[PDB]
Amino acid sequence: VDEMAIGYVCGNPAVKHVLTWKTTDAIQKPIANGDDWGGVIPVGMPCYSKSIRTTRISATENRETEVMDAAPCEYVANMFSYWRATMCYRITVVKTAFHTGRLEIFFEPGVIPVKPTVNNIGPDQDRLTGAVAPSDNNYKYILDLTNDTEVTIRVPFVSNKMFLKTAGIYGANSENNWNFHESFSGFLCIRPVTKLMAPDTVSDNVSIVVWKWAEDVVVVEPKPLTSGPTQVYRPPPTASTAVEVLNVEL
Amino acid sequence: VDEMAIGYVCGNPAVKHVLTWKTTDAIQKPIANGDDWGGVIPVGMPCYSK
Amino acid sequence: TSENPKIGPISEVASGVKTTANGIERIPVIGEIAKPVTTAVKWFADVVGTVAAIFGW
Amino acid sequence: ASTSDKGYDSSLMYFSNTATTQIVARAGNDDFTFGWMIGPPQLQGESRSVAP
Amino acid sequence: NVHNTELASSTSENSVETQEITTFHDVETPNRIDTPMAQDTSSARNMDDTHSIIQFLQRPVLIDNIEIIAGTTADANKPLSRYVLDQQNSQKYVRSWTLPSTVLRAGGKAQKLANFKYLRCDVQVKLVLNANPFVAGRMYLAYSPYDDKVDTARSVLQTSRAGVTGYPGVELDFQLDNSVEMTIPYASFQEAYDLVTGTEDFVQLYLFPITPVLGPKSESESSKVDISVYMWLSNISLVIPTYRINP
Amino acid sequence: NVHNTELASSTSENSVETQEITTFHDVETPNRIDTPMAQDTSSARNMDDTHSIIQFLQRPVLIDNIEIIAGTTADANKPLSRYVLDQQNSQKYVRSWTLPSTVLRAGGKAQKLANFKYLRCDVQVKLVLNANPFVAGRMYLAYSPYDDKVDTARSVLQTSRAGVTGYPGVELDFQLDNSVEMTIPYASFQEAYDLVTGTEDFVQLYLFPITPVLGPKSESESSKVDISVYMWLSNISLVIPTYRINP
Amino acid sequence: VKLVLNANPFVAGRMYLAYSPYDDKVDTARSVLQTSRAGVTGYPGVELDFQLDNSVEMTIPYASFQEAYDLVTGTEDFVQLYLFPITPVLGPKSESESSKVDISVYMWLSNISLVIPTYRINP
Amino acid sequence: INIGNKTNENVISFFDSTDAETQNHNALMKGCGEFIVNLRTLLRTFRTITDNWILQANTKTPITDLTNTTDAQGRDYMSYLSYLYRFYRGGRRYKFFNTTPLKQ
């Protein structure tokens, strides 16, 4: 099989979220337990989540470093400047035969409700409750969890732009967040319709595992849109040690 | 639909008994818990409970 | 059969397979380029074959 | 990163009579390809060197 | 002929022209400037289509979200009494929904039938139920037209158990059907439903417990029912334009 | 079979059912109760039809009502200057109208494209003029796309009389055409016009006096012009559903 | 490779069985144990849900750069096979009853060619 | 409504607009003018791996004194795409642009 076609490389799924939907969580409120970004999945080929490694240069200075978990479609879009693709998702619930509930997955296009921190961007679950953000007009799927487990969602490319940026979470913070919003055009939001109904002889948790890949992928420009070069993060041996810093001067 | 035919009016079902069959009740004994008339339903079109 | 005001455009091309080039369908590799062990690679074709240039003449 | 079997394929050696300084730019030839796909590693962002 | 402009032309004495509501006598035909050969704009026609106004009103919306913990000392777990001897011992219900005035307010359907006057609709209703397999129970979803209009003895809350369940309804067994649907017709004596100057609560929708919620006696584990309600309209006709809208 | 009710049925494991936006997995197919033979309601279908949502947006609305009394010491009677030597001597205009953000706000069109995201439109414009036969004058209705976006030297208000009237426009002679029409295309660089999160004042519409209002010198009789403006949309595509709307 | 899984119906969980060729040969940053969750599960693998599939099978090809695998004079650890937990084991909180997973592993060979006779065998 | 987890995956596609392979081809006639299908073709474009490779006079230097440093970085396409794959095959090309303050 031609293992280098953009179809074949981006059609490799990868797990972006493993959520935790408790029996205590409220209805019409996005599932935010465990992982960052909660039950808010930005629909898009670039990467949206990053960790920050902080080490010491001196006693009065810290050197930060942004580390990004890449899916095999998010790793290819970083090579290019603009993207356009039909994004596919497979939302899978890890449960027994005795956990029953209902789950809502709606698509909301445009700007994502986010909390810009001083060094990173997180979502805003306060603006996605059932009161302030009704899902009565969105495209939604109401998954039943009495027997059924999986659902595959194919979100096409909808925007007012012919292509979206591939910058994503690179260098995104409070001081700079424009290129983050212009990279996705939408977000899936996972909220419970019915609270998780479970007996006492089973666990009080289920897990929602979200796979991610892409179809019908076109890309534009063979230059990365990021400020620095594409650099693979080589993990250091000890937490105190440092990393490689690639320059930009010629 | 002709909503006044005796077929159509009498063919409207209604709940006459909601019984309660416990795990303590004996076998071969009619289920008499909760409602009156127990597990004895008089077969007939008229009314039997008042 | 291609609209271009430059006389012959570039790098004369061979042929391939019947599918869409992206959008997953498991593209076979042997079908893409058409050079198996045969009279189609020019160095095995020169000795199958046996032209005068493989002998230094 | 294979075993102690070394020198099993060819490479390049550079030579110059003067102390030079260059811009090296590589690519594969008409037969170069990768294969046998695995999953990606992580990526690296900026390095701000924050004040605290 | 000239480009990118228009002049005074003195054309014919015609063009009573109609923009679907508005006409527009215009003693002579007005001189038109337009795009000379139109190739208009972006690909909004390739994203989706479209929608119309009676296709906006067919969208389901959340209306209520019931939760029943058994329990219960409360009233929604109290089942249908066999008799009603007086009006202070009426039939207890889980939840009521007046119609169509609940579904018109909710989900932004109020904007898309403002500046109209009359309406036909069938209020489609879908319940969604979800309980664990160790909890049993049965409920009944009847609707009573003109229930808050008629004399008290003609209501659904003032009749026996065998009379309540004689209304148009559907069973909701907890372990046989997690969802029921129901079409409630155009329940109005007059022609098309008046949207302006009046709330016209025509049909009431009730949800009754036949049996109580049959959960295990192990407390601190919350045997639970957790019903959800979806409603939308169908067979829609929305006709006469006005400038008014009700407070 | 029974009448006027439904029971628990235990049907097949199917019916991923779509109400045009919402689906609705439903582990088994929900049991339906409905009108057994529908003959629904009143004659709302015989009064009018219907309308749709891109047929609501094609209705003309009043936007402005100009009156010019000549006169005049004021600015709307001051005609186009032959030159502009500095930015404090710009071209004076009767009235400006930013687009499409004027026509979307007015006439209740804001409700019928709330809860959508993208839009195509052509802003149709019709002027209505009415003066007595003893008053002459000529006006010009040009539109300048990105007029409040571009550099100041690229504007319509910062160019000569021969440059202003080189824009796409139409003459409005007081005694030859009492009404002019004009189609303003989809004037946006991006694909379909973003309705949520941003005012996007793309094309400006101006009304210039070429000649001053040529009325008689008899005062206390009010030589007068009295222009009225009508606008509506055309070639409409309204696609992606959201839950948000701009402040 | 065939895994065999067997848990009671009151225990849920999901696992992933990826294999990394030359995992103990390559540079440390090119390993499977030194990458993210979205990078681990980008390897060739299979889900092992506790309540959907009690057995998974997997064919691992001839993963060697050279021609036929040398049996004499050398251990040649070419492909590593790992078993990762995606989700933790979701058992009830009732102790002294042992919620449990109990996996078993079966392996065998296929497409076999065994050619040249020698007199030696490795220690 | 029996007890037991199940299968039968429900592929749903939002936004019934137009088949996407028509929309992509119509979007690259207006924004690119080129259609990058395969990642193999990015291994044939020369990308610079260094900007100042300083050497000494009369010294035979292998490229594996440079390539062994820059394979780990992932800057160019042959070292960024190599992290997705485990094998390779075929020759390599090089270009050596001079930046020396030469003497006459």
Author numbering:
A (entry chain C): 51 to 300
B (entry chain C): 51 to 100
C (entry chain D): 13 to 69
D (entry chain A): 157 to 208
E (entry chain B), F (entry chain B): 11 to 257
G (entry chain B): 135 to 257
H (entry chain A): 1 to 104
What is written in the article reporting this PDB entry?
The incubation of IAPV virions at 63°C resulted in a mixed population of full and empty particles. Cryo-EM images of the full particles were used to calculate a single-particle reconstruction to a resolution of 3.3 Å. The structure of the full virion could be built except for residues 1 to 10 and 258 to 318 of VP2. Residues 13 to 69 of VP4, among the 69 residues in the polypeptide, could be modeled in the cryo-EM map. The positioning of residue 69 from the C terminus of VP4 close to residues Asp186-Asp187-Phe188 of VP1 verifies the previous speculation that these residues form a putative catalytic site responsible for the cleavage of dicistrovirus VP0 into VP4 and VP3 subunits. The structure of the heated IAPV virion is nearly identical to that of the native virus, with a root mean square deviation (RMSD) of C-α atoms from the icosahedral asymmetric units of 0.76 Å. Accordingly, the internal volumes of the virion cavities are 6.2 × 106 Å3 and 6.3 × 106 Å3, respectively. This structural similarity indicates that IAPV does not form A particles before genome release. Whereas the capsid structures of the native and heated (63°C) IAPV virions were almost identical, there were differences in the distribution of the genomic RNA inside the particles. In heated IAPV virions, the RNA forms a 20-Å-thick shell with a higher density that tightly follows the inner face of the capsid and a sphere in the center of the virion with a radius of 80 Å. The changes in the distribution of RNA may facilitate the subsequent release of the genome from the IAPV virion.
